């Protein structure tokens, strides 16, 4: 018996990224970037700050051009592994990015010399979240999709909330820039007040989860949305939004989400979403099949393309999103078939008026969830949930029982659990991080139990009593008496 933890003298930890080829862990922290072995041993360290800067000055920062400059810490805002480089964006210097070598983070691969206002990527405020994903273009070139919340106490026009950026363009000094129409055009960024939670790729599209204010409906309310855009759509013709809600609309603020990840299926097709009454009580976990998402998004496209965004009964079901001056249309019925990602003749920025609704698979009184990870052990579905008090809940979900919170432990008192809950390559451990601590938790703490009566007293879907060997163990190491719903008894 033995554990494994990583700390940086109280320095905060912002993001965590795992290299699927080598298992190497990259950790973004305030003024640091760390490279760790799968057992959390330090392989290399890069300093990223502090720097004399101001959210009003532009990079390069000439000390004589910025008289309001002060020593500013650099919390990490984006940390993504791409096929042939590591993508790192900080909070300083208007959120500029750089590429570093995988396995050699001290080797700088690309940092443009004079970035323009088209290359200010991440949020330059450590209190505002940036999300991102890496994908492929039509000829295999690497692309970077970014979701960035509102900050404006900086320069230029507000960076669009969602953008598509080139990682290997012809001119390397143009890296991280976006084409003029490859973005989401939104007017009052301050008022919609985007707060991004997650981003993921499914099929040939990119998806974003975020909160923003619904300004057209009454009450000026924060709502949860999922977005979808074709990966190859360079004009965002294909953009569409859907509101998400749970328990009949009682829960509409999403806090974190995840798909199921396991040895069997790497990325599942159901989105498990945590809801809580927190804005920028009881928490709930709800399930959104990604098929249902695409179904409603497809119905929204057809209705705004061909029936003026109205349903057969004449009811408004879709509309043009945000403050874009445009309109739904009466295009031919076969327009979605001919142009699934849109054209310059089709209504763009679309939003569905009809929400996608789910039922709660689990309720947690007095808990505020902040992170979600889901996996499968022999057909059973297990969720690992972090909360705002530093605890890690383990829950059995399907097929039976469902309301089965079977374990709970404290990682760091009063310190929220980070959304970047990551599993190792063999899904035997969960990397869990709070504000100042990173821990490698075992998913199956079975060998702790010595006798059958002990192995069965502490019920755990991973664990069960073998009789061939004297071990309480996982199922896939043996006849096996399950600890959760035992098939027999004891002696």
């Amino acid at each position, epitope marked *: 018996p033995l554990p494994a933890a990583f700390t940086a003298n109280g320095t905060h930890l912002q993001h965590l990224a795992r290299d699927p080829t080598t298992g190497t862990l990259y950790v973004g922290a305030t003024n640091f970037l760390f490279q760790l072995s799968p057992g959390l041993q330090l392989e290399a360290v890069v300093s990223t700050g502090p720097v004399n800067d101001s959210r009003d000055c532009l990079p390069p920062v000439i000390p004589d051009e910025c008289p309001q400059a002060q020593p500013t810490n650099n919390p990490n805002q984006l940390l993504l592994v791409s096929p042939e480089a590591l993508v790192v964006c900080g909070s300083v210097h208007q959120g500029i990015c750089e590429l570093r070598s995988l396995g050699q983070i001290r080797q700088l691969l690309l940092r443009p010399e004079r970035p323009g206002d088209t290359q200010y990527v991440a949020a330059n405020d450590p209190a505002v979240s940036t999300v991102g994903l890496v994908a492929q273009g039509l000829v295999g070139e690497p692309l970077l999709f970014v979701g960035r919340g509102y900050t404006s106490r900086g320069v230029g026009g507000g960076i669009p909330p969602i953008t598509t950026r080139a990682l290997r363009p012809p001119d390397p000094q143009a890296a991280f820039s976006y084409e003029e129409t490859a973005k989401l055009a939104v007017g009052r960024l301050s008022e919609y007040s985007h707060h991004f939670v997650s981003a993921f790729v499914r099929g040939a599209s990119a998806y974003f989860l975020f909160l923003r*204010r*619904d300004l057209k*409906a*009454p*009450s*000026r*309310a*924060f*709502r949860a949305y999922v977005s979808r855009v074709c990966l190859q759509d360079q004009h965002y013709y294909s953009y569409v939004e859907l509101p998400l*809600a749970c*328990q*009949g*609309g*009682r*829960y*509409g*603020l999403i806090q974190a989400a995840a798909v199921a990840t396991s040895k069997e299926v790497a990325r599942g097709d159901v989105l498990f979403a945590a809801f809580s*009454s*927190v*804005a920028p009580g009881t928490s709930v976990l709800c399930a959104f099949p990604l098929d249902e998402v695409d179904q409603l998004a497809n119905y929204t496209r057809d209705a705004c393309y061909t029936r003026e965004g109205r349903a057969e009964n004449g009811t*408004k*079901v879709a509309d043009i999103a945000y403050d874009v001056l445009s309109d739904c249309a009466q295009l031919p019925v076969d327009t979605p078939d001919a142009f699934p990602c849109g054209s310059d003749h089709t209504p763009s920025p679309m939003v569905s*008026c*009809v*929400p996608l*609704e789910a039922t709660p698979i689990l309720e947690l009184p007095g808990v505020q969830l902040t992170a979600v990870a889901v996996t499968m052990e022999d057909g059973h579905t297990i969720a690992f949930l972090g909360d705002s008090q530093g605890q890690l809940h383990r829950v059995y979900l399907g097929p039976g029982r469902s309301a089965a919170p079977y374990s709970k432990q404290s990682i760091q008192p009063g310190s929220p659990v980070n959304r970047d809950l990551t599993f190792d390559g063999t899904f035997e451990h969960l990397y869990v991080a709070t504000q100042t601590t990173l821990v490698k938790v075992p998913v199956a703490p079975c060998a702790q139990h010595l006798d059958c009566d002990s192995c069965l007293a502490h019920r755990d879907p991973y664990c069960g009593w073998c009789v061939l060997l004297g071990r309480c163990s996982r199922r896939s190491e043996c006849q096996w008496l399950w600890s959760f719903q035992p098939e027999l008894g004891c002696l």
Partner: nanobody
Amino acid sequence: VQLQESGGGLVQAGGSLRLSCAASGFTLGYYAIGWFRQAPGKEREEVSCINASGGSTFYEDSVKGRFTISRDNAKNTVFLQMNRLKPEDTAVYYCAAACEVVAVGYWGQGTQVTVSA
């Protein structure tokens, strides 16, 4: 653009009262509509909730069993029927196009509900 509350007043503990949350000059959308109250010297709190189809209704435990919420699409109004009243149900009652207090960005003037014992 905004919903309007009405129907408040004074009754005796044990009586009834139906509240009205109406759309003036527009159609009710597919948002869930919730009712709220703020007793004097207390923070605003949730009361009830109903989705667009009327299939889902939620009541807090303080009013579960006595209050009934309903949505009339033809009248563009959500009603709150308040039976078996108590002096603790004295508060200003609000409605919004959301069911969580912290998600609402604009509140109306509410309707005053006073219950004598």
